[PDB]
């Protein structure tokens, strides 16, 4: 019952500000201090600060003092985090987390929101270019062949990738996206299949990118 | 600030094993220390607070000890759901800080990668860039080296790697290495090769093609 629900993913440009919200359900919002913690992709956890939802009093990590701002609206059981003067270093997942707050002091963060992804970039929204990774003509007789799709130059995350509209799932590896030096994301999705199936079974990767409202279906065949 | 150092950064263990992970603080934090578990794509979950007290609902196979500067977390017998990342956190003074995490992964038998190379598509080449992809599929342990050679010249700075999370079923890893060149640079060379080193291989493996 005791849960924190956070607002959805955001993109902002450098220098701008982002406001994320966190609403408490299943307990008394004013009964526990609330922390904000962020996690950059592939990195650990960094404490931003905390707020007393009853009083509104805050203590901010001094690294963020005057840049990050915590507020609350008691009527709607909601806490807000304003991260201002954004740079790419602020990209990451932002969590609100309740403290048990025994003895009116920090004890441990026992209820966490689901996190809010914040991407800070000057890149423009772009759907991916989808290119075939074609199965080798040297694929092993009676053996296993690999093929795939290169999903390149899109912004922001995420894309969804399926094979044959979901009918092919076994042996699929859709790799974590990497941020290219250009500021656009890229990944490959590969699948291993029987060599006997080449030419006999059609393979199509389905790549959807909601921010750009794009859907691509790319047939992948021996060259 | 106070720095928390966790060890090991990466722990390999088998289901059923007893393991202990360590958190050291640069200054004394008394008992004001918590432990968390985090799984990919999820928020952390609280395990331990006051350095030794189990959070409600946490299984009894978890326990923790310590005061001052030295803390440990122990799992008496690991279950498959326990392979995850673990963090310690102190609250003794500002700013609150977390350790760097200990990732606990499953041991399995050594598995050599199956290696595949993919030339750039003609469609991509039309646009002025060439991506060459080298795939290492279903290998264990995670350590692998991929080197790109273009006309027998070792490449640096022009490739990126991505690695999957350990597979939930077979406990292997897969890896992609992607070499990116301008179209001009690509056609200025013939032989494209990725060389793969992994301890499961009797010998390092080269997969290559000739452009065209």
């Amino acid at each position: 019952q005791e849960v924190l629900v956070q607002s959805g993913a955001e993109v902002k440009k450098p220098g701008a500000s982002v406001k994320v919200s966190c609403r408490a359900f299943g307990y008394t919002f004013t009964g526990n201090a609330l922390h904000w913690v962020r996690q950059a992709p592939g990195q650990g956890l960094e404490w931003l600060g905390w707020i007393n939802p009853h009083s509104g009093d805050t203590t901010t990590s001094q690294k963020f003092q005057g840049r990050v701002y915590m507020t609350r609206d008691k009527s709607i059981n909601t806490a807000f985090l304003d991260v201002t003067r954004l740079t790419s270093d602020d990209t990451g997942i932002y969590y609100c987390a309740r403290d048990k707050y025994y003895g009116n002091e920090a004890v441990g963060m026992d209820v966490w929101g689901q996190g809010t992804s914040v991407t800070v970039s000057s890149a423009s929204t772009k759907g991916p270019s989808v290119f075939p990774l074609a199965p080798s003509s040297k694929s092993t007789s009676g053996g296993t062949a690999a093929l795939g799709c290169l999903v390149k130059d899109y912004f922001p995350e995420p894309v969804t990738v399926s094979w044959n509209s979901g009918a092919l799932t076994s042996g699929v590896h859709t790799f974590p996206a990497v941020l290219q030096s250009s500021g656009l994301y890229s990944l490959s999705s590969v699948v291993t299949v029987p060599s006997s199936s080449l030419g006999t079974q059609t393979y199509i990767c389905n790549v959807n990118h909601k921010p750009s409202n794009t859907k691509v279906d790319k047939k992948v065949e021996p060259k | 600030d106070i720095q928390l150092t966790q060890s090991p950064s990466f722990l390999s263990a088998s289901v059923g094993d007893k393991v202990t992970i360590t958190c050291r603080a640069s200054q004394g934090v008394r008992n004001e220390l918590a432990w968390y578990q985090q799984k990919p794509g999820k928020a952390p979950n609280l395990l331990i607070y006051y350095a030794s007290t189990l959070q409600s609902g946490v299984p009894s196979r978890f326990s923790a000890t310590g005061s001052g500067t030295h803390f440990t977390l122990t799992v008496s017998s690991l279950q498959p759901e326990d392979f995850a990342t673990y963090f310690c956190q102190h609250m003794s003074s500002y700013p609150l800080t977390f350790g760097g995490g200990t990732k606990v992964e499953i041991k399995r038998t050594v598995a050599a990668p199956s290696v595949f190379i993919f030339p750039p598509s003609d469609e991509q080449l039309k646009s002025g860039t060439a991506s060459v992809v080298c795939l290492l599929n279903n290998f264990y342990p995670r350590e692998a080296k991929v080197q790109w050679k273009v006309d027998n010249a070792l490449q640096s700075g022009n490739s990126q790697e991505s690695v999957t999370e350990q597979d939930s079923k077979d406990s292997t890893y897969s890896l992609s290495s992607t070499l990116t060149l301008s179209k001009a640079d690509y056609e200025k060379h013939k032989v494209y090769a990725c060389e793969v080193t992994h301890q499961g291989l009797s010998s390092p493996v080269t997969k290559s093609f000739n452009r065209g």
Binding site: T28, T30, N32, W50, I51, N52, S55, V107 | -
Partner: peptide, 8 residues
């Protein structure tokens, strides 16, 4: 431990 005051 650090603290941010009374709650309700």
């Amino acid at each position: 431990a650090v603290g941010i005051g009374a709650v309700f």
